[PDB]
């Protein structure tokens, strides 16, 4: 089932961002988000994962950090920029 | 009843902080609190003493200074730091 280990990933930035996100590393994950091709979807996935993990967090500091992921803010700001630029390509990006 | 005058105090910082606190010297007392071994208990004792003395204060300026002792704030901030650090040793410190 698993792919070839010697074969490079089709979406390297996606996997790196997802990996960095699963472990509450936000600075490294933000950097990976800044390099990925599809950023609105990545930010929404990140905020979903963070708000799902906030419930599973044990330490209070980690839970607080996860509750302040501000990944939805990244998607909102980037889409505001996109909508201000084109407002016609923004709809296509959404759908 | 009194101990030996030539015998050094078992808790020097505690006595110095308590002494400096009984006379509304806050800067000297804050310095003594910063050097004492047990700081949360010392801060709570200080805020208790200050809110007890605020009633006995004669001058309005001294009463105002005592009402703004912010010693409870010291305990809260230090315990927030402790809870952020360990969150398991914090409970033992509390109890």
């Amino acid at each position: 089932n698993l792919p070839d280990m010697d074969r490079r990933c089709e979406h390297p930035w996606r996997d790196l961002f997802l990996w960095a996100i699963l472990q509450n590393r936000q600075e490294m994950a933000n950097y990976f988000w800044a390099m990925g091709p599809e950023a609105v979807a990545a930010a929404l996935v990140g905020c979903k994962i963070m708000k799902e993990m906030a419930h599973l967090a044990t330490e209070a500091e980690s839970a607080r950090s996860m509750k302040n992921a501000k990944y939805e803010q990244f998607a909102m700001d980037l889409f505001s920029e996109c909508y201000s630029n084109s407002e016609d390509r923004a709809y296509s990006l959404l759908v």
Side-chain angles (χ1 to χ4, degrees), chain A residues 2-5 7-9 11-26 28-51 53-58 60 62-87 89-95:
Chain A
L2 264 71
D4 215 8
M5 295 298 102
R7 172 169 82 158
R8 39 175 80 177
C9 288
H11 308 281
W13 293 113
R14 198 265 328 275
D15 298 320
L16 276 189
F17 165 80
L18 188 63
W19 163 79
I21 271 289
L22 286 167
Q23 40 203 37
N24 194 20
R25 284 173 178 186
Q26 268 157 56
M28 184 141 56
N30 286 9
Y31 168 69
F32 288 147
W33 173 86
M35 307 272 137
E38 290 168 348
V40 190
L44 296 172
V45 162
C47 75
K48 167 62 176 174
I49 295 179
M50 292 288 247
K51 74 172 43 172
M53 291 195 308
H55 306 147
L56 277 76
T58 80
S62 87
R64 179 149 40 65
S65 79
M66 294 184 201
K67 288 163 183 341
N68 305 334
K70 71 173 46 57
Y71 273 105
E72 179 184 22
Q73 190 62 43
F74 291 171
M76 287 174 41
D77 291 348
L78 189 153
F79 185 76
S80 309
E81 178 80 24
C82 291
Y83 193 68
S84 297
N85 188 259
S86 183
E87 170 146 354
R89 279 159 187 211
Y91 299 155
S92 302
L93 177 73
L94 273 188
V95 308

